[PDB]
Ligand binder design. Sequence first.
Ligand SMILES: Cc1cc2nc3c(=O)[nH]c(=O)nc-3n(C[C@H](O)[C@H](O)[C@H](O)COP(=O)(O)OP(=O)(O)OC[C@H]3O[C@@H](n4cnc5c(N)ncnc54)[C@H](O)[C@@H]3O)c2cc1C
Ligand SMILES: Nc1ncnc2c1ncn2[C@@H]1O[C@H](COP(=O)(O)OP(=O)(O)NP(=O)(O)O)[C@@H](O)[C@H]1O
Ligand SMILES: CC[N+](C)(C)CCCS(=O)(=O)[O-]
Ligand SMILES: [Cl-]
Ligand SMILES: [Mg+2]
Ligand SMILES: [Mg+2]
Ligand SMILES: [Mg+2]
Ligand SMILES: [Mg+2]
Length: 485
Amino acid sequence: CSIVWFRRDLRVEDNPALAAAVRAGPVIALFVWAPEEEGHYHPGRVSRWWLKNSLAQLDSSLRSLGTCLITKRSTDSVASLLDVVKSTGASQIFFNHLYDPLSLVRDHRAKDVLTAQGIAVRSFNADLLYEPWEVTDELGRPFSMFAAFWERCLSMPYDPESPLLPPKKIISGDVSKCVADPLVFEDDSEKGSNALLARAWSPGWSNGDKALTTFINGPLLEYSKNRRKADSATTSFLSPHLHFGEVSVRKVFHLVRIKQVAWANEGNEAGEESVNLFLKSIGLREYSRYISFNHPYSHERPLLGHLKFFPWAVDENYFKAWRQGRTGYPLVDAGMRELWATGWLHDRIRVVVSSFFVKVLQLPWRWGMKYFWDTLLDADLESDALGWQYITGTLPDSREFDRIDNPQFEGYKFDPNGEYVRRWLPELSRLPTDWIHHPWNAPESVLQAAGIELGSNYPLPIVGLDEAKARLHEALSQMWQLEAA
Ligand SMILES: Cc1cc2nc3c(=O)[nH]c(=O)nc-3n(C[C@H](O)[C@H](O)[C@H](O)COP(=O)(O)OP(=O)(O)OC[C@H]3O[C@@H](n4cnc5c(N)ncnc54)[C@H](O)[C@@H]3O)c2cc1C
Ligand SMILES: Nc1ncnc2c1ncn2[C@@H]1O[C@H](COP(=O)(O)OP(=O)(O)NP(=O)(O)O)[C@@H](O)[C@H]1O
Ligand SMILES: CC[N+](C)(C)CCCS(=O)(=O)[O-]
Ligand SMILES: [Cl-]
Ligand SMILES: [Mg+2]
Ligand SMILES: [Mg+2]
Ligand SMILES: [Mg+2]
Ligand SMILES: [Mg+2]
């Protein structure tokens, strides 16, 4: 008896722990659901809906290969392990690493208790191209900025392990344990709100493979010339799959690396450029793990402390307006609406709405981080923290802090004909393009004809940009003054 402990590596292909267990003797595939152990960050409704369907496909797969997935509901995953080994008679437990703060601790506490109880525990790399410790500068120190880190990752002395085949068969230790703990990922209220998700997404590794294929053989070619596109099938849509290890980044990297070689050869410039930007995307995810491991309180504590005494507005209705998409800036409200209704946001809108959150409303970034974590289909602690820290300006490589983006111009850049704003704001569905990104200026006759009553079915800017720059300054004058102490 060997135990395979699945957490966020829901796949049978290129899964090192599983492959090591099959090499060793029969297996008991285990998954333990223990949210309260996740603190302030238990999984949100749409993430849970994804987990529920991803696990079903995982179990279905494992059954095809010979064993079932045993699920356990508990308040302490370690304890559950013990009660599983101490009931099955297993001597080893194989699992794949995780690099988020909450996982880092529980994993150590896990190794200690189990090994110090007579259990062999082995741990592999299932989620990264390279372990964060394998990637370092010539002196041997962790890089402090993305570019230097990514340049090393791409110029390493050795290649990432190549995707392993899933087992061809698995033998299962005590099959009488197959009927285990039912996991409930939805209350009746939520079942209601989740009803459209199955129409747009197919959770699981099988479908993730499908998405990777689709992407590489289609949109990747125009990945680069298509990113100012706000709501189009121009990206991979792999994030939710990536978050639960349903798809191997190593496989992703290998397929992308083959296309790049073929396109370099052909001298297809668009292709190379798109390949480069997409690899930078995979790079950023790898970097979020790097930062979380080399700064264990990164999901709450900022890296740079130069904004330490900054007087962040703690205004509750500023927050509510943001969440409701009642800020007055069309592109910002469209994003909040699409996020609330679908749990999905293109990276540019994520930047647009989180940026408005810290520079215009000037709210604490931990609040935007948490809201995103509860509502995004790909909620990921490391990727969410990294994004918020970068936007707020607490990262070595963030853009200049004293800079406020104009949603009206972002509107012109990312949603030139107002199609995005009109899809997510039906109240503005009749407003012509000349005023779609700044309706508060518009002549009364256009508003009346479109059915828009400023302040009613569409609000006036909750904070003007000019007034915004001014509070930003007044806020800096203050933090500088607080520094003097
Ligand atoms: C403030 C903010 C919060 C974010 N929160 C999350 C989150 O909670 N979960 C999440 O996975 N991503 C998050 N991101 C990053 C990014 O927007 C999403 O990963 C991406 O939009 C998912 O779409 P895709 O799968 O089509 O990405 P693609 O463009 O197809 O890229 C492929 C993969 O690269 C990775 N990736 C791409 N961009 C980034 C990025 N900027 N940072 C980290 N990884 C990236 C993702 O795994 C993505 O699936 C956030 C970005 C910002 C600015
Ligand atoms: N250093 C970084 N750390 C974390 N995230 C980053 C970093 N740099 C960029 N990002 C993320 O990747 C996105 C794109 O990077 P950026 O440097 O803005 O190029 P870009 O978006 O292609 N610019 P543009 O060509 O005008 O569209 C950012 O908006 C963030 O989502
Ligand atoms: C536009 C991308 N959509 C279709 C919404 C998601 C891709 C489907 S999935 O779940 O198989 O990746
Ligand atoms: Cl500053
Ligand atoms: Mg698919
Ligand atoms: Mg795009
Ligand atoms: Mg698009
Ligand atoms: Mg940019």
